[PDB]
A and B are shown apart, each in its own frame.
Chain A
Amino acid sequence: RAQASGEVAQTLTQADQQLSAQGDQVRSGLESSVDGLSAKLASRILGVDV
């Protein structure tokens, strides 16, 4: 059980590092759309093209 907990902790830390890096990567992709998404939302609230 201790060995299983240790290996689970190891894979958890590895996955945490990998997911943090991959989220840092996908941050640029999200920022690539942020502007168009904001424009679309503004147009939707106004009921007309922004």
Chain B
Amino acid sequence: LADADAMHAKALADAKAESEKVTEEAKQDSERIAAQLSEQAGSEAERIK
């Protein structure tokens, strides 16, 4: 039962760390996607001009 408590705490800590890593990667990929869409917007505006 004790080990179970330690494993639950470790699982929660690992889940928090992995959530932080996943959200960091997601923010990076979101920034890249926004940059790509903004560049595409610039290209579309140039084409219209």
Q: Is the contact region of chain A dominated by helix, strand, or loop, or is it mixed?
A: helix
* B41 close to A (CB within 8 Å): yes
Contact with A along B6-49 (1 / 0, CB 8 A): 00000000000000000000000000000000000100110011
Q: Is the contact region of chain B dominated by helix, strand, or loop, or is it mixed?
A: helix
* A3 close to B (CB within 8 Å): yes
Bound-state Cα–Cα, A14 to B14, Å: 64
Q: Which residues from B are CB-within-8-Å of A7?
A: 49
Bound-state Cα–Cα, A7 to B48, Å: 10
* A45 close to B (CB within 8 Å): no
13 example contacts (A-B, Cβ-Cβ < 8 A) are as follows A1-B41, A1-B44, A1-B45, A1-B48, A3-B45, A4-B44, A4-B45, A4-B48, A4-B49, A5-B48, A7-B49, A8-B48, A8-B49
